[PDB]
Coordinates of N, CA and C and ligand atoms in Angstrom, one line a residue:
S1 N 32.7 19.4 81.5 CA 32.4 18.1 80.8 C 31.7 17.1 81.2
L2 N 30.3 17.4 81.6 CA 29.3 16.7 81.7 C 29.4 14.9 80.8
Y3 N 29.7 15.4 79.7 CA 29.8 14.2 78.9 C 31.2 13.4 78.8
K4 N 31.3 12.1 79.2 CA 32.4 11.3 79.1 C 32.8 10.8 77.8
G5 N 31.7 10.4 77.0 CA 32.0 10.0 75.6 C 31.2 10.6 74.5
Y6 N 31.5 10.6 73.2 CA 31.1 11.0 72.1 C 30.6 10.1 71.0
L7 N 29.7 10.1 70.3 CA 29.0 9.2 69.5 C 29.1 10.6 68.3
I8 N 30.0 10.4 67.2 CA 29.9 11.3 66.1 C 29.5 10.9 64.8
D9 N 28.6 11.4 64.1 CA 28.1 11.5 63.0 C 29.4 11.8 62.0
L10 N 29.3 11.4 60.7 CA 30.3 11.7 59.6 C 30.0 12.8 58.6
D11 N 29.3 12.2 57.8 CA 29.1 13.4 56.7 C 28.0 14.4 57.2
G12 N 28.1 15.6 56.6 CA 27.5 16.5 57.1 C 28.0 17.3 58.5
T13 N 28.7 16.4 59.0 CA 29.2 17.0 60.6 C 30.9 17.2 60.8
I14 N 31.4 16.2 60.6 CA 32.9 16.2 60.4 C 33.6 16.9 59.3
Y15 N 32.7 16.5 58.0 CA 33.0 16.9 56.7 C 31.8 17.2 56.0
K16 N 31.8 17.6 54.6 CA 30.7 17.7 53.9 C 31.0 17.3 52.5
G17 N 30.4 16.0 52.2 CA 30.8 15.3 51.0 C 32.2 15.4 50.7
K18 N 32.4 16.0 49.6 CA 34.2 16.2 49.5 C 34.9 17.4 50.1
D19 N 34.0 18.2 50.5 CA 34.4 19.4 51.3 C 34.7 19.1 52.8
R20 N 35.6 20.2 53.2 CA 36.1 20.1 54.4 C 35.0 21.2 55.4
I21 N 35.4 20.7 56.7 CA 34.5 21.4 57.9 C 35.5 21.6 58.9
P22 N 36.5 22.4 58.7 CA 37.8 23.0 59.6 C 37.4 22.6 61.0
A23 N 36.1 23.1 61.5 CA 35.6 23.1 62.7 C 35.6 21.6 63.3
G24 N 34.8 20.8 62.3 CA 34.6 19.6 62.7 C 35.9 18.8 63.1
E25 N 36.9 19.1 62.2 CA 38.2 18.3 62.4 C 38.9 18.8 63.7
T26 N 38.8 20.0 64.1 CA 39.5 20.7 65.1 C 38.7 19.8 66.3
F27 N 37.3 19.8 66.2 CA 36.5 19.1 67.2 C 36.9 17.7 67.6
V28 N 37.4 16.8 66.3 CA 37.8 15.5 66.6 C 39.6 15.5 67.6
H29 N 40.1 16.6 66.9 CA 41.5 16.6 67.5 C 41.4 17.0 68.9
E30 N 40.6 17.8 69.4 CA 40.5 18.2 70.8 C 40.0 16.8 71.7
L31 N 39.0 16.2 71.2 CA 38.6 15.1 71.5 C 39.8 14.0 72.0
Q32 N 40.9 14.0 71.0 CA 41.9 13.1 70.9 C 43.0 13.6 71.7
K33 N 43.0 14.8 71.6 CA 44.1 15.7 72.6 C 43.5 15.4 74.2
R34 N 42.3 15.8 74.3 CA 41.8 15.8 75.7 C 41.4 14.4 76.1
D35 N 42.1 13.3 75.2 CA 42.0 11.9 75.8 C 40.4 11.2 75.8
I36 N 39.6 12.0 75.4 CA 38.2 11.5 75.5 C 37.8 10.3 74.3
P37 N 37.1 9.3 75.0 CA 36.8 8.1 74.1 C 35.5 8.7 73.1
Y38 N 35.6 8.1 72.0 CA 34.7 8.8 70.6 C 34.3 7.8 69.9
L39 N 33.4 7.5 69.2 CA 32.9 6.5 68.4 C 32.1 7.1 67.2
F40 N 32.6 6.9 65.8 CA 32.2 7.7 64.6 C 31.0 6.6 64.2
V41 N 29.8 7.0 64.3 CA 28.5 5.9 63.8 C 28.1 6.7 62.6
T42 N 28.1 5.7 61.5 CA 27.5 6.3 60.2 C 26.6 5.0 59.8
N43 N 25.4 5.5 59.1 CA 24.4 4.8 58.3 C 25.2 4.2 56.7
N44 N 26.1 4.7 56.5 CA 26.4 4.8 55.0 C 27.3 3.3 54.7
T45 N 26.7 2.2 54.2 CA 27.3 0.8 53.7 C 28.2 1.2 52.8
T46 N 27.8 1.8 52.0 CA 28.9 1.9 50.6 C 30.3 2.2 50.6
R47 N 30.7 2.3 51.9 CA 32.1 2.5 51.9 C 32.4 1.7 53.3
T48 N 33.3 0.9 53.4 CA 33.7 0.0 54.3 C 34.5 0.7 55.5
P49 N 34.5 0.2 56.9 CA 35.0 0.9 57.9 C 36.6 1.3 57.5
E50 N 37.5 0.4 57.1 CA 38.5 0.8 56.9 C 38.9 1.8 55.9
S51 N 38.1 1.9 54.8 CA 38.0 3.0 53.9 C 37.6 4.3 54.1
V52 N 36.8 4.3 55.3 CA 36.7 5.4 56.0 C 37.8 6.2 56.5
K53 N 38.3 5.4 57.4 CA 39.8 5.7 57.9 C 40.6 6.2 57.0
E54 N 40.8 5.5 55.8 CA 41.7 6.0 54.9 C 41.3 7.4 54.4
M55 N 40.0 7.7 54.2 CA 39.2 8.9 53.6 C 39.9 10.0 54.7
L56 N 39.3 9.9 55.8 CA 39.6 10.6 57.0 C 41.1 11.2 57.2
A57 N 42.0 10.0 57.0 CA 43.4 10.4 57.1 C 43.9 11.4 56.0
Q58 N 43.5 11.0 54.9 CA 44.2 11.5 53.4 C 43.3 12.7 53.1
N59 N 41.8 13.0 53.5 CA 41.3 14.0 53.2 C 40.9 15.0 54.2
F60 N 40.8 14.5 55.4 CA 40.2 15.4 56.3 C 41.3 15.8 57.7
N61 N 42.4 15.4 57.5 CA 43.4 15.4 58.5 C 43.2 14.8 59.6
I62 N 42.2 13.6 59.9 CA 42.0 13.0 60.9 C 42.6 11.5 60.8
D63 N 43.3 11.1 61.8 CA 44.2 10.1 62.2 C 43.6 9.2 63.1
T64 N 42.3 8.4 62.8 CA 41.8 7.7 63.8 C 41.9 6.1 63.8
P65 N 41.8 5.4 64.7 CA 41.9 4.0 64.8 C 40.7 3.1 64.1
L66 N 40.9 2.1 63.7 CA 39.6 1.2 63.0 C 38.8 0.9 63.9
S67 N 38.9 0.9 65.3 CA 37.9 0.5 66.1 C 37.2 1.6 66.6
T68 N 37.2 3.0 66.0 CA 36.5 4.1 66.2 C 35.6 4.4 65.0
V69 N 35.5 3.6 64.1 CA 34.6 3.7 63.0 C 33.6 2.6 62.9
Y70 N 32.5 2.9 63.6 CA 31.3 2.0 63.6 C 30.1 2.3 62.4
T71 N 30.0 1.2 61.5 CA 29.5 1.6 60.3 C 27.8 0.7 60.4
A72 N 27.0 1.1 59.9 CA 25.8 0.4 59.8 C 26.0 -1.1 59.3
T73 N 27.0 -1.3 58.7 CA 27.4 -2.7 58.5 C 27.6 -3.5 59.4
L74 N 28.6 -3.0 60.5 CA 28.8 -3.6 61.6 C 27.8 -4.3 62.5
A75 N 26.7 -3.1 62.8 CA 25.6 -3.4 63.3 C 24.4 -4.3 62.8
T76 N 24.5 -4.3 61.3 CA 23.7 -5.5 60.7 C 24.2 -6.9 60.9
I77 N 25.8 -7.0 60.6 CA 26.1 -8.4 60.7 C 26.1 -8.9 62.3
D78 N 26.2 -7.8 63.5 CA 26.0 -8.2 64.6 C 24.7 -8.6 64.9
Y79 N 23.8 -7.9 64.3 CA 22.3 -8.4 64.4 C 22.0 -9.7 63.9
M80 N 22.5 -10.0 62.8 CA 22.4 -11.3 61.9 C 22.9 -12.4 62.9
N81 N 24.0 -12.1 63.4 CA 24.7 -13.2 64.3 C 24.1 -13.2 65.5
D82 N 23.4 -12.2 66.0 CA 22.5 -12.2 67.2 C 21.4 -13.3 67.0
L83 N 20.6 -12.9 65.9 CA 19.4 -13.5 65.6 C 19.6 -15.2 65.4
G84 N 20.8 -15.2 64.7 CA 21.1 -17.0 64.5 C 20.4 -17.7 63.7
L85 N 19.4 -17.2 62.7 CA 18.7 -18.1 61.8 C 20.1 -18.9 60.9
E86 N 19.6 -19.6 60.1 CA 20.5 -20.4 59.3 C 21.6 -19.2 58.5
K87 N 22.6 -19.6 58.4 CA 23.5 -18.6 57.7 C 23.6 -18.5 55.9
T88 N 22.4 -18.2 55.4 CA 22.1 -18.2 53.9 C 21.3 -16.6 53.9
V89 N 22.0 -16.0 52.7 CA 21.5 -14.6 52.5 C 21.5 -14.3 51.2
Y90 N 20.8 -13.4 50.9 CA 20.7 -12.7 49.5 C 20.9 -11.1 50.0
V91 N 21.7 -10.6 49.2 CA 22.1 -9.2 49.5 C 22.0 -7.9 48.4
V92 N 21.5 -7.1 48.4 CA 21.3 -5.9 47.5 C 22.3 -4.9 48.1
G93 N 23.3 -4.3 47.5 CA 24.1 -3.5 47.9 C 25.5 -3.4 47.4
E94 N 26.5 -2.4 47.9 CA 28.0 -2.6 47.3 C 28.8 -3.6 47.9
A95 N 29.7 -3.9 46.8 CA 30.9 -4.7 47.4 C 31.2 -5.0 48.9
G96 N 31.5 -4.0 49.5 CA 32.1 -3.9 51.1 C 30.9 -4.9 51.7
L97 N 29.8 -4.2 51.7 CA 28.7 -4.9 52.4 C 28.8 -6.5 52.2
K98 N 28.6 -6.7 50.9 CA 28.8 -8.2 50.7 C 29.9 -8.9 51.1
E99 N 31.0 -8.3 50.7 CA 32.4 -8.8 51.2 C 32.4 -9.2 52.6
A100 N 31.6 -8.4 53.4 CA 31.8 -8.7 54.8 C 30.5 -9.8 55.6
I101 N 29.4 -9.5 54.9 CA 28.4 -10.4 55.1 C 28.9 -11.9 54.9
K102 N 29.9 -12.4 53.8 CA 30.1 -13.7 53.8 C 31.6 -13.9 54.3
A103 N 32.2 -12.8 54.6 CA 33.5 -13.2 55.6 C 33.0 -13.7 56.7
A104 N 31.6 -13.2 57.1 CA 31.1 -13.7 58.3 C 30.5 -15.1 57.9
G105 N 29.9 -15.7 58.7 CA 29.3 -17.1 58.1 C 28.3 -17.3 57.1
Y106 N 28.0 -16.0 56.5 CA 26.9 -16.1 55.4 C 27.1 -16.5 54.0
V107 N 26.5 -17.2 53.4 CA 27.0 -17.9 52.2 C 25.4 -17.3 51.2
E108 N 25.9 -17.0 50.2 CA 24.7 -16.6 49.4 C 23.8 -17.8 48.8
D109 N 22.3 -17.3 48.9 CA 21.4 -18.2 48.5 C 20.2 -17.1 47.8
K110 N 20.1 -17.5 46.4 CA 19.4 -16.5 46.0 C 17.6 -17.3 45.8
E111 N 17.5 -18.1 46.0 CA 16.2 -18.8 46.3 C 15.3 -18.9 47.6
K112 N 16.0 -19.4 48.6 CA 15.5 -19.7 49.7 C 16.3 -19.3 50.7
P113 N 17.0 -17.9 50.9 CA 17.7 -17.4 52.1 C 17.1 -17.3 53.3
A114 N 17.7 -17.3 54.6 CA 17.1 -17.0 55.6 C 16.9 -15.5 55.8
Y115 N 18.2 -14.7 55.4 CA 17.8 -13.4 55.5 C 18.2 -12.6 54.1
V116 N 17.3 -11.8 54.2 CA 17.7 -10.7 53.0 C 18.1 -9.5 53.5
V117 N 19.3 -9.0 52.8 CA 19.8 -7.8 53.7 C 19.8 -6.7 52.5
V118 N 19.1 -5.7 52.7 CA 19.2 -4.8 51.7 C 19.7 -3.3 52.0
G119 N 20.7 -2.8 51.4 CA 21.4 -1.5 51.6 C 21.6 -0.7 50.3
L120 N 22.1 0.4 50.3 CA 22.2 1.2 48.8 C 23.3 0.5 47.9
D121 N 22.8 0.5 46.9 CA 23.5 -0.2 45.6 C 23.3 0.8 44.3
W122 N 24.6 1.4 44.6 CA 24.5 2.6 43.3 C 24.5 2.1 42.0
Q123 N 24.3 0.5 41.8 CA 23.9 0.0 40.3 C 22.8 -1.0 40.7
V124 N 21.7 -0.7 41.7 CA 20.8 -1.6 41.8 C 19.8 -1.4 40.5
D125 N 19.2 -2.8 40.3 CA 18.4 -2.8 39.0 C 17.2 -3.8 39.2
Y126 N 16.5 -3.9 38.3 CA 15.1 -4.9 38.4 C 15.6 -6.1 38.8
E127 N 16.3 -6.8 38.0 CA 16.6 -8.1 38.6 C 17.0 -8.5 40.1
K128 N 17.7 -7.4 40.3 CA 18.1 -7.6 41.9 C 16.9 -7.5 42.8
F129 N 16.1 -6.4 42.2 CA 14.7 -6.2 43.0 C 13.8 -7.5 43.1
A130 N 13.5 -8.0 41.9 CA 12.8 -9.2 41.7 C 13.2 -10.4 42.4
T131 N 14.6 -10.6 42.4 CA 15.4 -11.7 43.2 C 15.0 -11.4 44.8
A132 N 15.3 -10.2 45.3 CA 14.9 -9.8 46.6 C 13.5 -10.0 47.0
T133 N 12.4 -9.7 45.9 CA 11.1 -9.7 46.3 C 10.7 -11.3 46.5
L134 N 11.4 -12.2 45.6 CA 10.7 -13.3 45.6 C 11.2 -14.1 46.8
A135 N 12.5 -13.7 47.2 CA 13.1 -14.1 48.7 C 12.2 -13.8 49.7
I136 N 12.1 -12.4 50.0 CA 11.3 -12.2 50.9 C 9.8 -12.6 51.1
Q137 N 9.2 -12.9 49.8 CA 7.8 -13.5 49.9 C 8.0 -14.8 50.2
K138 N 9.0 -15.3 49.9 CA 8.9 -17.0 50.5 C 9.6 -17.2 51.9
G139 N 9.3 -16.0 52.7 CA 10.0 -16.0 54.3 C 11.2 -15.6 54.6
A140 N 12.0 -14.9 53.8 CA 13.2 -14.5 54.4 C 13.1 -13.3 55.4
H141 N 13.9 -13.3 56.3 CA 14.0 -12.2 57.0 C 14.5 -10.8 56.6
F142 N 13.6 -10.1 56.6 CA 14.0 -8.9 55.5 C 14.4 -7.6 56.6
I143 N 16.0 -7.4 56.2 CA 16.5 -6.5 56.9 C 17.0 -5.4 55.9
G144 N 16.8 -4.1 56.5 CA 17.0 -2.8 55.8 C 18.5 -2.2 56.6
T145 N 19.3 -2.0 56.1 CA 20.6 -1.6 56.2 C 20.3 0.0 57.3
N146 N 19.7 1.0 56.5 CA 19.5 2.2 57.1 C 18.4 2.7 56.2
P147 N 17.3 3.5 57.2 CA 16.2 4.1 56.5 C 16.3 5.3 55.6
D148 N 17.5 6.1 55.9 CA 17.5 7.3 54.9 C 16.8 7.1 53.4
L149 N 16.0 7.9 53.0 CA 15.6 8.1 51.9 C 16.3 8.8 50.9
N150 N 17.2 9.5 51.3 CA 17.9 10.2 50.3 C 19.6 10.2 50.6
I151 N 20.6 10.2 49.7 CA 21.6 10.3 50.0 C 22.5 11.6 49.3
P152 N 23.2 12.6 50.1 CA 23.8 13.4 49.1 C 25.0 13.1 48.5
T153 N 25.0 13.7 47.3 CA 26.2 13.4 46.5 C 26.5 14.6 45.8
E154 N 27.7 14.8 45.2 CA 28.0 16.1 44.6 C 27.3 16.5 43.4
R155 N 26.0 15.5 43.3 CA 25.1 15.5 42.3 C 23.5 15.9 42.6
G156 N 23.4 16.1 44.1 CA 22.1 16.2 44.5 C 21.7 15.3 45.5
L157 N 20.4 15.4 46.0 CA 19.8 14.4 46.7 C 19.2 13.1 46.2
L158 N 20.0 12.0 45.9 CA 19.8 10.9 45.1 C 19.0 9.8 46.0
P159 N 18.5 8.9 45.6 CA 17.7 7.9 46.2 C 18.7 7.2 47.2
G160 N 18.3 6.9 48.3 CA 19.0 6.6 49.5 C 18.7 4.8 49.7
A161 N 19.2 4.2 50.7 CA 18.8 3.1 50.9 C 17.4 2.8 51.2
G162 N 17.1 3.8 51.9 CA 15.4 3.7 52.5 C 14.5 3.5 51.2
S163 N 15.0 4.2 50.3 CA 14.0 4.1 49.2 C 13.9 3.0 48.6
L164 N 15.0 2.2 48.2 CA 15.3 1.0 47.7 C 14.5 0.0 48.5
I165 N 14.7 0.1 49.9 CA 14.0 -1.0 50.8 C 12.5 -0.5 50.6
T166 N 12.0 0.6 50.6 CA 10.6 0.6 50.6 C 10.0 0.1 49.5
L167 N 10.7 0.0 48.4 CA 10.3 -0.7 47.0 C 10.1 -2.0 47.4
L168 N 10.9 -2.8 48.0 CA 10.8 -4.0 48.4 C 9.7 -4.2 49.6
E169 N 9.5 -3.4 50.3 CA 8.5 -3.6 51.2 C 7.2 -3.2 50.7
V170 N 6.7 -2.4 49.7 CA 5.6 -2.3 49.3 C 5.3 -3.5 48.3
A171 N 6.4 -4.3 48.0 CA 6.2 -5.1 46.8 C 6.2 -6.6 47.4
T172 N 6.4 -6.4 48.7 CA 6.4 -7.6 49.5 C 5.4 -7.8 50.6
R173 N 4.9 -6.5 50.8 CA 3.7 -6.1 52.1 C 4.5 -6.8 53.1
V174 N 5.9 -6.7 53.4 CA 6.8 -7.3 54.6 C 7.5 -6.1 55.1
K175 N 7.0 -5.4 56.3 CA 7.6 -4.5 57.0 C 9.3 -5.1 57.4
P176 N 10.3 -4.0 57.1 CA 11.7 -4.7 57.5 C 12.1 -4.2 58.8
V177 N 13.4 -4.8 59.0 CA 13.8 -4.5 60.3 C 15.1 -3.4 60.0
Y178 N 14.8 -2.2 60.5 CA 16.0 -1.1 60.6 C 17.0 -1.2 61.3
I179 N 18.3 -1.3 60.6 CA 19.5 -1.4 61.5 C 19.8 -0.1 62.1
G180 N 20.4 0.7 60.9 CA 21.1 2.2 61.2 C 20.1 3.2 62.0
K181 N 20.8 4.4 62.5 CA 20.3 5.5 63.1 C 18.9 6.0 62.5
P182 N 18.1 6.4 63.2 CA 17.7 6.3 64.6 C 17.5 5.0 65.2
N183 N 17.5 3.9 64.8 CA 16.8 3.0 65.6 C 17.9 2.3 66.7
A184 N 17.2 1.6 67.8 CA 18.0 1.2 68.7 C 19.0 0.2 68.5
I185 N 19.0 -0.6 67.6 CA 19.6 -2.0 67.1 C 21.1 -1.2 66.9
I186 N 21.3 -0.3 66.0 CA 22.9 0.2 66.2 C 23.4 0.9 67.1
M187 N 22.3 1.8 67.9 CA 22.8 2.5 69.0 C 23.3 1.7 70.2
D188 N 22.1 0.7 70.5 CA 22.9 -0.3 71.5 C 24.2 -0.6 71.5
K189 N 24.4 -1.1 70.4 CA 25.8 -1.7 69.9 C 26.7 -0.7 69.9
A190 N 26.4 0.4 69.9 CA 27.2 1.8 70.0 C 27.5 2.1 71.4
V191 N 26.7 2.3 72.1 CA 26.6 2.5 73.7 C 27.4 1.3 74.3
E192 N 27.4 0.3 73.8 CA 27.7 -0.8 74.3 C 29.5 -0.8 74.0
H193 N 29.9 -0.4 72.9 CA 31.1 0.0 72.1 C 32.0 0.7 73.3
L194 N 31.4 1.8 73.7 CA 32.1 2.9 74.5 C 32.0 2.3 75.9
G195 N 31.0 1.4 76.1 CA 30.8 1.0 77.5 C 30.6 2.0 78.4
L196 N 29.9 3.3 78.0 CA 29.6 4.2 79.1 C 28.0 4.3 79.4
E197 N 27.7 5.1 80.3 CA 26.3 5.0 80.6 C 25.9 6.3 79.6
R198 N 24.6 5.9 78.8 CA 24.0 6.9 78.2 C 23.8 8.4 78.7
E199 N 23.7 8.5 79.9 CA 23.6 9.7 80.8 C 24.9 10.7 80.5
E200 N 26.1 10.0 80.7 CA 27.4 10.7 80.2 C 27.8 10.6 78.7
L201 N 26.7 10.5 77.9 CA 27.2 10.4 76.4 C 26.5 11.4 75.9
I202 N 26.8 11.6 74.6 CA 26.2 12.6 73.7 C 26.4 12.4 72.1
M203 N 25.4 12.1 71.5 CA 25.4 11.8 69.8 C 25.5 13.1 69.1
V204 N 26.2 13.2 68.4 CA 26.5 14.6 67.6 C 26.3 14.5 65.8
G205 N 25.5 15.2 65.4 CA 24.8 14.9 64.2 C 24.5 16.3 63.5
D206 N 24.3 16.0 62.2 CA 23.7 17.2 61.2 C 22.2 16.8 60.9
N207 N 21.7 15.7 61.0 CA 20.5 15.0 60.7 C 19.5 15.0 61.8
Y208 N 18.4 15.8 62.1 CA 17.6 15.7 63.2 C 17.0 14.1 63.1
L209 N 16.1 13.8 62.1 CA 15.5 12.4 61.7 C 16.4 11.2 62.1
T210 N 17.8 11.5 61.6 CA 18.8 10.2 61.9 C 19.5 10.2 63.3
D211 N 20.4 11.2 63.1 CA 21.3 11.6 64.5 C 20.6 11.9 65.8
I212 N 20.1 13.2 65.6 CA 19.2 13.8 66.9 C 18.3 12.7 67.4
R213 N 17.3 12.3 66.5 CA 16.2 11.2 67.0 C 17.0 10.0 67.5
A214 N 18.3 9.8 67.2 CA 18.8 8.5 67.5 C 19.0 8.6 69.1
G215 N 19.5 9.8 69.6 CA 19.3 10.1 70.9 C 18.0 10.4 71.7
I216 N 17.3 11.0 71.2 CA 15.8 11.1 71.8 C 15.3 10.0 72.0
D217 N 15.1 9.0 70.8 CA 14.5 8.0 71.0 C 15.1 6.9 71.7
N218 N 16.4 7.0 72.2 CA 17.3 6.1 72.8 C 17.9 6.7 74.0
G219 N 17.3 7.8 74.4 CA 17.6 8.4 75.9 C 19.2 8.5 75.7
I220 N 19.5 9.4 74.9 CA 21.0 9.9 74.8 C 20.9 11.3 74.6
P221 N 21.8 12.0 75.2 CA 22.0 13.6 75.1 C 22.3 14.0 73.6
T222 N 21.9 14.8 73.1 CA 22.2 15.2 71.7 C 22.9 16.6 71.4
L223 N 23.6 16.9 70.7 CA 24.3 18.1 69.9 C 24.0 18.1 68.7
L224 N 23.2 19.2 68.0 CA 23.1 19.2 66.7 C 23.7 20.5 66.0
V225 N 24.5 20.2 64.7 CA 25.3 21.2 64.1 C 24.4 21.5 62.7
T226 N 24.0 22.6 62.7 CA 23.3 22.8 61.5 C 24.1 23.2 60.3
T227 N 25.1 22.3 60.3 CA 26.0 22.5 59.1 C 25.8 21.3 58.0
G228 N 24.7 20.7 58.1 CA 24.2 19.8 57.1 C 22.7 19.9 56.6
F229 N 22.2 18.6 56.8 CA 20.8 18.6 56.7 C 19.8 19.5 57.2
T230 N 19.4 19.1 58.4 CA 18.7 20.4 59.3 C 19.0 21.5 59.2
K231 N 18.4 22.3 58.8 CA 18.9 24.0 58.5 C 18.6 24.6 59.6
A232 N 19.3 25.8 60.3 CA 19.1 26.6 61.3 C 17.7 27.2 61.3
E233 N 17.1 27.7 60.1 CA 15.9 28.1 60.1 C 14.8 27.1 60.6
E234 N 15.0 26.0 60.6 CA 14.1 24.9 61.2 C 14.5 24.3 62.5
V235 N 15.3 24.9 63.1 CA 16.0 24.5 64.5 C 14.7 24.7 65.4
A236 N 13.9 25.7 65.2 CA 12.8 26.0 66.3 C 11.6 25.5 65.4
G237 N 11.1 24.4 65.8 CA 9.9 23.9 65.1 C 10.1 22.4 65.1
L238 N 11.1 21.9 65.3 CA 11.4 20.2 65.7 C 10.4 19.7 66.7
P239 N 10.1 18.5 66.5 CA 9.3 17.8 67.6 C 10.3 18.1 69.0
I240 N 10.7 16.9 69.3 CA 11.4 17.3 70.6 C 12.7 17.7 70.3
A241 N 13.1 19.1 70.7 CA 14.5 19.6 70.5 C 15.5 19.0 71.2
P242 N 16.8 19.2 70.3 CA 17.9 18.9 70.8 C 18.6 19.3 71.9
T243 N 19.4 18.3 72.7 CA 20.0 18.8 73.8 C 20.9 20.3 74.0
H244 N 21.3 20.1 72.8 CA 22.3 21.3 72.4 C 22.1 21.5 71.2
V245 N 22.1 22.8 70.5 CA 22.3 23.1 69.6 C 23.3 23.9 69.1
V246 N 23.8 24.1 67.9 CA 24.8 25.0 67.6 C 24.9 24.9 66.1
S247 N 25.7 26.2 65.6 CA 25.8 26.5 64.2 C 27.1 26.3 63.6
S248 N 28.0 25.7 64.5 CA 29.4 25.5 64.4 C 30.0 24.5 65.6
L249 N 30.6 23.5 65.3 CA 31.3 22.8 66.1 C 32.3 23.7 67.3
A250 N 32.7 24.5 66.7 CA 33.6 25.7 67.3 C 32.9 26.4 68.5
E251 N 31.8 25.9 69.0 CA 30.9 26.7 69.9 C 30.5 25.5 71.2
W252 N 31.6 24.7 71.3 CA 31.7 23.5 72.2 C 32.9 23.9 73.0
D253 N 32.8 23.3 74.4 CA 33.9 23.4 75.1 C 34.0 22.4 76.3
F254 N 35.1 22.7 77.1 CA 35.1 22.0 78.6 C 33.6 21.6 78.8
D255 N 33.2 22.5 79.8 CA 31.7 22.5 80.2 C 31.2 24.0 80.1
Ligands
MG1 MG1 25.0 12.8 58.0

């Protein structure tokens, strides 16, 4: 076990949509049995950290602490607090995202906010986009929670946060600061959470462009499970290959 810590993706890796992935569950159990420090890191902001925990326990037999569920939302609020601009903001996204933003020191300002935070909003519409545009044009710090252009639902690959964010980008001509995988911002705060050296850490995911590249671009060993986005047929043909590749997490052990 050259790896002391584990950064784990959720959708497509530990489970698939509303479906189970028994192996992924067993994998988490081993990590728990074996006393190994792990951290779940997801880009999805439409579900709060505590809501994840709930889902995991009631749907995928995983009983995990709250501190082990790192969402792109946490990394975004951390970032905002780090930058320290005045605490005014305009948000496009789901209630959870907004609830936390204001739960921190940020009050909503529709005209001249210091920050404009954009995440996936299942009910985004024109008015919200126009409000966001004007705010960003007037100089607000444009933040995109996660780059994902698509989000898999039990309905297909619908528009993800990235697409909504891109619309505001080409409408304000202002490039946003992406928080989620595979950006350094969330990964730094994640490596910091486990407080372990990237050398002895490994990121596990099903998506090359987000999970895998999250390690490559940030110097962190990677494990790719072709149970989700990146299909096995394409494992050979990727830019920088993943440290380890596997068709199922049941092919991983001690050393
Ligand atoms: Mg995924």
